[PDB]
């Protein structure tokens, strides 16, 4: 890493995939997926969605490396599913933080 902070928590947000397999399949294993993100604070980094791009690409990698030291590895599939959640979780944190900045 190098200065990515953990965001707040909001359980494992439910995502749609257009297909009863992928949709239920996510659910079936949402009891192991991320409930917080890795982002960076302000006075150094900011944007609308780009402030989530790097964040998500970090939180995600972090749950892959963790498995490797445990003797496990997610795939690009379990990562592509995380990319949807971890994004919205990063945007939902960003908004809650932005409501201070905007309120200044």
Swiss-Prot record:
Membrane-crossing residue ranges in chain numbering: none
Organism superkingdom: Eukaryota
Carbohydrate attachment residues: 57, 73
Disulphides: 55-90
Post-translational changes noted in the entry: The glycosylation pattern (the amount of mono-, di- and non-glycosylated forms or glycoforms) seems to differ in normal and CJD prion.
Outcome when changing residue 79 to I: In CJD; uncertain significance
Record note on what altering residue 3 to V does: Protective factor against Kuru; protective factor against prion disease; confers protection against classical Creutzfeldt-Jakob disease (CJD) and Kuru in the heterozygous state but can be infected with variant CJD prions resulting from exposure to bovine spongiform encephalopathy prions; confers complete resistance to all prion strains when homozygous; acts as a 'dominant negative' inhibitor of prion conversion; is not only itself resistant to conformational conversion, but also inhibits conversion of wild-type proteins
Subcellular location, record wording: Cell membrane; Golgi apparatus
Outcome after substituting residue 95 to K: Confers relative protection against sporadic Creutzfeldt-Jakob disease (CJD) in the heterozygous state
Family of the protein in this entry: Belongs to the prion family.
Clinical disorder: PrP is found in high quantity in the brain of humans and animals infected with neurodegenerative diseases known as transmissible spongiform encephalopathies or prion diseases, like: Creutzfeldt-Jakob disease (CJD), fatal familial insomnia (FFI), Gerstmann-Straussler disease (GSD), Huntington disease-like type 1 (HDL1) and kuru in humans; scrapie in sheep and goat; bovine spongiform encephalopathy (BSE) in cattle; transmissible mink encephalopathy (TME); chronic wasting disease (CWD) of mule deer and elk; feline spongiform encephalopathy (FSE) in cats and exotic ungulate encephalopathy (EUE) in nyala and greater kudu. Creutzfeldt-Jakob disease: Occurs primarily as a sporadic disorder (1 per million), while 10-15% are familial. Accidental transmission of CJD to humans appears to be iatrogenic (contaminated human growth hormone (HGH), corneal transplantation, electroencephalographic electrode implantation, etc.). Epidemiologic studies have failed to implicate the ingestion of infected animal meat in the pathogenesis of CJD in human.
Primary role: Its primary physiological function is unclear. May play a role in neuronal development and synaptic plasticity. May be required for neuronal myelin sheath maintenance. May promote myelin homeostasis through acting as an agonist for ADGRG6 receptor. May play a role in iron uptake and iron homeostasis. Soluble oligomers are toxic to cultured neuroblastoma cells and induce apoptosis (in vitro). Association with GPC1 (via its heparan sulfate chains) targets PRNP to lipid rafts. Also provides Cu(2+) or Zn(2+) for the ascorbate-mediated GPC1 deaminase degradation of its heparan sulfate side chains.
Entry domain remark: The normal, monomeric form, PRPN(C), has a mainly alpha-helical structure. Misfolding of this form produces a disease-associated, protease-resistant form, PRPN (Sc), accompanied by a large increase of the beta-sheet content and formation of amyloid fibrils. These fibrils consist of a cross-beta spine, formed by a steric zipper of superposed beta-strands. Disease mutations may favor intermolecular contacts via short beta strands, and may thereby trigger oligomerization.
Assembly description: Monomer and homodimer. Has a tendency to aggregate into amyloid fibrils containing a cross-beta spine, formed by a steric zipper of superposed beta-strands. Soluble oligomers may represent an intermediate stage on the path to fibril formation. Copper binding may promote oligomerization. Interacts with GRB2, APP, ERI3/PRNPIP and SYN1. Mislocalized cytosolically exposed PrP interacts with MGRN1; this interaction alters MGRN1 subcellular location and causes lysosomal enlargement. Interacts with KIAA1191. Interacts with ADGRG6.
Note: This protein is produced by a bicistronic gene which also produces the alternative prion protein/AltPrP (AC F7VJQ1) from an overlapping reading frame.
Protein's recorded name: Major prion protein
Organism: Homo sapiens (Human)
Organism lineage string: Eukaryota, Metazoa, Chordata, Craniata, Vertebrata
Gene designation: PRNP
